[PDB]
């Protein structure tokens, strides 16, 4: 019950007590882990299920709690009056709303709690952007603008996120029906291949069947899905000069230019549920920098989405006939240098996994030192290459689901009523 | 219950119904899940754990039940005859004893659900060796040559367990106190410094006490450690003809050679305990042949090993001075090129990991269409380098822990009660 982790590395040991405040499931039983399943039923949120007010209350005690603790009021006269106050708008309102400063701790220690995420050294550095005022797609469109370009900042990335109005009977959602505010279109093709992203030939699909004109070329920035209110979705184009594109040359093979690569510097999810006090906030759209690997190994090598593995590999002369001489993993290798350096020279933000990983360690230590422990899905931190060579990989982890957290959430044109 | 796992790389789902006849725990609750660490409190099995006539025979039935079906015997007169047989043995000597047949089927499906394993593809070709009439520790070390022997087979590598007698009343265990048959020693230096793998430090310090006259060069052969029927191990020197070893170098870089490295062909493990309906076998040496990355990755690349990766990165004159110019991932895919290279060079069996896992998927599926499932610990699947780039990253896994099974063990030297 008072769980000890330990690093086979460097045989460290860290005592968990902060998974005893565990509030969800994780999937898991005695009798067969989950943990590899990639959207068991406790991390999404189907919006059918909307909250009753006797559900309500104690999720919002149980979040206040924390908050005054952490301010170091707890039990204290400010902390009673708001447990009253907010008790009593439940009461009468069946919701409640919160406060500027909550809010804030809420988007903070959502991220703190993002067991998969492994940037979360930097949890309270976090720029929350308050749109519980937005109520049109245009009025959107216009704070995810100004989060772009206050993230972007120039090259130099900020983490930012911007809250739009919390759920209410599920029928005046907001949503982003972008997964990215900042993604390539996919294009199905005649003569049966896929140009651009794989991953978005649906959604670039719904872009066209709600009338959007793609120039269809292979790294088409798409347009902004938006809607407010639970109405119909608008499209809007992201203008172009915010957004900060990176073309991908080597550093020693100069041929790498002529495949004619580039990835955008903002990764920015706005598919997600965040989740505080009970109350539930369907667009949230959340931005950081970049993992050297999330572009160059999976975006561009994975079979699902760009795969250039064999194109690189052919221009780097390497024996393609047998899987031994490990030609794959030479270009894999290249291809991250790559990125990394095309990054870096362009001076956009982005951090490589070694320097992460390392990262996400000290995090841990901090963690367990000051708060007793950090939730963390070892699936997800190990980087998909070099894993053993990472910090990480040595490392066990606990995995179980604090709150406030981001969730996932069902596609939007599954469930909208139109 | 039905469960449904995906693949998202190929969108192929299937439903896994085996999990329901499962037994053990896995160290999982609703409200935690401890899928990444490593040994389990349900993974392993502490020798003072003997087991009563209580539940032994009910794990026996379960066994000899699962057995029969195979044989498409459930029910049948044999069937009850040794339900009746195993039962009165019981309740007459507080144990029992496997037939050879039943021996072979339980050592098969321990292979078989093995849900770390990558090899599972294999698992119907285990060549089963009963060394049960077994009485010492010369007698272990002549079977133990044997296995060596018929297993490397010149370097067309086979697939074989050696089994010696099930525990009792846990005072008279038979182990074999390597970790595995074919491993290097470890010397810690006085200057804090390794000489050899720093894994085998602890040990090599052991076989040294028992009177081991230690060469004290990097890659040296550790003796067998053999305790047979609780008594104090004994010290065997493993003839070198019988271990096959190949010396490391690159295919396009001559001065790999000069690094001195080589390695063992038989990657043959000792320290695990076998289950079989109930019976617990502390000594079950297993060997089949290496997947590249376990030398390439693990065993040359780890800081607590032989860690060579800064001195390969010295010689290909990378950029050292900073982790973003990826010479550490540079490197490491070198020398697993060199030690595939190598090993093929010598006719020595092995296997890239990108082989393997396409491998294991297919025999996952395989398993999931005739069987209902097929238990895989996702954590130990994956291969320690290029993992989303090989088809089981993309593959979702169910970890569930069936019986027959191999199960982890304390350290005798831990446990052991000495006698002098
Ligand atoms: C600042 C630099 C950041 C880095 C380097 C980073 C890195 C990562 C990486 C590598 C993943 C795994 C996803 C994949 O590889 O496919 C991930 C997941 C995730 N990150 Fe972070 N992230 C950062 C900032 C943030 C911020 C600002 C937030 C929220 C405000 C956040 C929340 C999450 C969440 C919710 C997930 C997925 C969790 C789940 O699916 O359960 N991250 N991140
Ligand atoms: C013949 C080719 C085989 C290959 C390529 C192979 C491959 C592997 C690999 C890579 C691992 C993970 C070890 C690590 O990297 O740390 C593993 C684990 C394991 N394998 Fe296999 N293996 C083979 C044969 C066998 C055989 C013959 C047995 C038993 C009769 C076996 C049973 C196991 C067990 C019990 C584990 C660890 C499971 C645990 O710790 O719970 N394998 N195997
Ligand atoms: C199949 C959907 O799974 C995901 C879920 C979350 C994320 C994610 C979410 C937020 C991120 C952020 C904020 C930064 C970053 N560098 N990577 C991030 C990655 C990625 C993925 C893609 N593997
Ligand atoms: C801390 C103990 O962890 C292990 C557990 C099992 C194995 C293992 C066990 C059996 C194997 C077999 C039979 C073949 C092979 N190629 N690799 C094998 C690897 C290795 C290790 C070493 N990482
Ligand atoms: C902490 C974690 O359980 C540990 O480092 C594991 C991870 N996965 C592994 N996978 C394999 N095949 N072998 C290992 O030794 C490990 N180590
Ligand atoms: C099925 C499996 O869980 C799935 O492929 C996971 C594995 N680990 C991952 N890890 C990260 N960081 N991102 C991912 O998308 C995935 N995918
Ligand atoms: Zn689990």
Redo the contacts with the bound molecule.
């Keep these: 019950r008072f769980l000890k982790v330990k690093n086979w590395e460097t045989d460290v040991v860290l005592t968990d007590t902060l998974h005893l405040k565990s509030t969800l499931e994780t999937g898991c039983t005695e009798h067969i882990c989950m943990g590899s399943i990639m959207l068991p039923s406790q991390?999404t949120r189907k919006p059918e299920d909307v909250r009753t007010k006797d559900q309500l209350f104690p999720l919002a005690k149980e979040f206040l709690d924390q908050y005054y603790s952490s301010i170091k009021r707890f039990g204290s006269k400010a902390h009673m009056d708001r447990l009253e106050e907010v008790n009593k708008e439940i009461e009468s309102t069946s919701t409640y709303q919160l406060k500027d400063t909550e809010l804030i701790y809420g988007?903070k220690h959502?991220?703190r709690n993002?067991?998969?995420?492994?940037?979360?050294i930097?949890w309270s550095k976090?720029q929350v952007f308050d749109a519980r005022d937005c109520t049109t797609a245009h009025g959107m469109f216009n704070y995810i603008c100004n989060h772009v370009k206050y993230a972007t900042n120039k090259g130099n990335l900020r983490?930012?996120?911007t809250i739009f109005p919390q759920r209410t009977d599920g029928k005046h959602d907001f949503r982003v029906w972008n997964s990215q505010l900042i993604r390539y279109a996919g294009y199905k093709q005649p003569d049966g291949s896929t140009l651009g992203d794989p991953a978005n030939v649906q959604f670039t699909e719904i872009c066209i069947q709600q009338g959007w004109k793609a120039p269809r070329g292979r790294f088409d920035v798409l347009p902004l899905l938006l809607q407010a209110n639970g109405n119909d979705p608008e499209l809007f184009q992201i203008p172009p000069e915010l957004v900060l594109e990176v073309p991908i040359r080597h550093p020693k093979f100069d041929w790498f230019k002529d495949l004619g690569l580039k990835w955008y510097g903002l990764?920015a999810?706005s598919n997600?549920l965040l989740e505080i006090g009970g109350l539930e906030f369907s667009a949230c759209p959340?931005?950081?920098?970049?993992?050297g690997?999330?572009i160059g190994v999976?975006d561009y090598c994975d079979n699902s989405r760009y795969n250039i593995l064999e194109e690189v590999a052919k221009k780097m002369d390497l024996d393609m006939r047998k899987t031994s001489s490990l030609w794959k993993d030479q270009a894999l290798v290249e291809i991250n240098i790559a990125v990394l350096y095309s990054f870096q020279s362009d001076k956009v933000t982005i951090?490589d996994h070694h320097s992460?990983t390392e990262s996400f360690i000290k995090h841990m230590e901090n963690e367990y030192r000051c708060r007793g422990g950090c939730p963390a899905?070892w699936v997800?931190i190990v980087p998909?290459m070099s894993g053993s060579i990472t910090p990480v990989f040595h490392q066990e982890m606990l995995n179980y689901r604090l709150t406030p957290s981001?969730e996932?959430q069902p596609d939007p044109w599954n469930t909208h009523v139109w």
Aim: proline content about 6%.
């Design positions: 991390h988007a959502a991220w993002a067991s998969r995420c492994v940037g979360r930097q976090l983490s930012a996120i990764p999810v997600m959340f931005s950081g920098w970049y993992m690997t999330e999976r951090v992460a899905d997800w998909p981001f996932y």
